[PDB]
Symmetry: C3
Subunit: 273 residues, 3 copies
């Protein structure tokens, strides 16, 4: 009779045991990341593999962040940890044939492209804002190129950390060391500073000022000007003088002495009373 209709409901309709309720669905969905944002509490691993990932500096990357339509930073990594077991950000490449950079910054804008600040510690310690090391003997550890009209390509300022004028007496703006190989080195013949102009310059090669006043320079011809009393702990070789304030050579002195001697001996030999 109507046992047909009841059997049809028993077959056609879904058991509550064999389907998730809306409450159970919400529990399961709430464990997944929404596209509108969320909090990840474990490791998110990216392992692209035949996934169409591109190198493009606009649309590429396993992660791409495009801030063109938004305020704010693309990415922020923050820690207030007292100590920990590794750095905040690591970039690593293992193959000697790897033919791309770890990091490329392609910057247009009106401020500094990369800005690195080491804040004042409570106790001074030997640590730097930037540490660069290379073990490649075929290349300069670091390269800088600029096109400045009226500034230095590299600008270094040393500021006295203290109000007292003698406090920084052992400091320098630039400090250079030249060392032998650490493990078993027999010495070194490396140079301190090498300056060239491959195409040739009209400028001074070295210009030293103090309170904006010229004190010492080396010109494009290699001649120097020194602004005060100076010393050579040794002999100085120079050209024979042709002007009043030119340094006299031993030859010039000896020739003038011999000329006077000859002239006087002649007068002495020939005078009469």
């Amino acid at each position: 009779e109507t046992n047909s209709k009841i059997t049809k409901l028993e077959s056609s309709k879904a058991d509550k045991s064999a389907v998730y309720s809306k409450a159970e669905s919400k529990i399961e969905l709430d464990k997944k990341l929404s596209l509108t944002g969320g909090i990840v509490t474990g490791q998110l691993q990216f392992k692209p593999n035949k996934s169409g990932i591109k190198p493009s500096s606009s649309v590429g990357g396993a992660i791409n962040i495009d801030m063109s339509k938004s305020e704010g930073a693309a990415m922020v990594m923050y820690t207030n940890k007292d100590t920990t077991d590794g750095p905040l950000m690591i970039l690593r490449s293992d193959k000697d044939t790897f033919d791309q950079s770890a990091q490329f910054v392609d910057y247009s804008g009106k401020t500094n492209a990369v800005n690195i600040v080491m804040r004042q510690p409570s106790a001074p310690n030997f640590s730097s804002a930037l540490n660069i090391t290379s073990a490649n003997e075929g290349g300069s550890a670091m390269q800088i190129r600029g096109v400045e009209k009226a500034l230095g390509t590299l600008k270094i300022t040393h500021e006295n950390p203290n109000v007292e004028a003698k406090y920084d007496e052992n400091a320098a703006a630039l400090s250079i060391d030249i060392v032998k190989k650490q493990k078993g080195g027999k010495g070194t013949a490396a140079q301190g500073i090498y300056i060239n102009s491959t195409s040739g310059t009209a400028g001074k090669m070295l210009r030293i000022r103090n309170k904006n006043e010229d004190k010492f320079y080396v010109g494009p011809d290699g001649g120097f000007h020194s602004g005060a009393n100076s010393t050579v702990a040794g002999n100085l070789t120079v050209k024979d003088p042709t002007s009043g304030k030119h340094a006299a050579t031993k030859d010039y002195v000896d020739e003038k002495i011999a000329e006077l001697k000859k002239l006087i001996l002649k007068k002495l030999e020939h005078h009469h009373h």
Copy 2:
């Protein structure tokens, strides 16, 4: 019959209490697929007893492994005209923090980190890289290299203009030495300090122009200058022992006194 019905009423799922397939798709489409998607809000990482490691291969709250894939690991791009902060920020707050903000461990055949400042429409005072330290106990920056036949740091200044005098006020390296900005009474800091702690046979300073030696300071501190030079003051030197050595006042005075003595002796003792 009322038993069979009651059983249906209990065992079967209500339409109000279950999502349809259409509603399931709507809800799933709001969640990120492992195969990729577009996130439009903030993704926050807050690991906490989560087994996060420092390993430079498998560590990180985010780990990107590009070993089996072309492309960049990460790209941050903006075409915004202006904005309220930098693209990427790394920040550590504790002065006891004992790791770097960024570590680059590079093997390869090109430059590990490469920073380019493109030509602006109008020149302005901005840099590719700006470094500042307020730590008096350490050098703001350190560089170490092992070059066979190059500089550890190579700086090139290129004239921005075709005209040869345009860059006459520029330099490759510019150094300033200043007093403390707030209330400083002065400074005794040095410009350039060059040493060889282990000792070098090389020239300490070598200056060339068109690849030709013009001026140098040797490993012993002796200098060679390639043209006419000036001291606005006296120069102290050793007494000359060779023809082109500069003569001292003493050498001149001794030679004058020697001649004087010899002549006065002849004058005193001649007879007619």
Copy 3:
């Protein structure tokens, strides 16, 4: 009864609802907040999304490591070759008024540390390469507040045990070049040293094995520690001390003084 019609309306059809097994298949394709492996591109396109610049809580991605060990982010590759760099930061508008990267570091080690490992063969590549085409600004700026060190410290280490191997190397190498495309020359300087506020220190101090060899003082006077040469004339002041270099004037005046004195004695002696 038509309680059967009410069951037909109130209850869900099996065809129109996912089973628990089908739900799990679909959920397993989505990222859990507890972690997982993404195998495609994750794109961030915030747009009126409340993204902030804050260096603590901002970013389209924010990683806070305050309550966890480990690194925030690791980018790793063991690829032999590839078609672009691991990480790229790019800004396109010349009006852009923020940095690409800002590091705000407190701590007791190096804020940024860049290492180029020993390659299998030497090649011309660097740990860091900096280039600017902005003529209005220094390509690079460094400021420090060192008590007793250099603001920039450069060390050259001999790559080889043999002492003459690195004879062409330097710690600092400077070149001064004309514009590559059509440049007629340059007047740029090599090294420019100043103290705008004025310093009592030596402007240039050169040592070898920690011993002073050559220096330029704050007044511009120099000291050289060994025999030296000028391929040219040296202009100096007239000497007033025994070891001062004599000028041509000093020599000529002393010669003329002796000459006069002798001619006078010669003119006036009797015997």
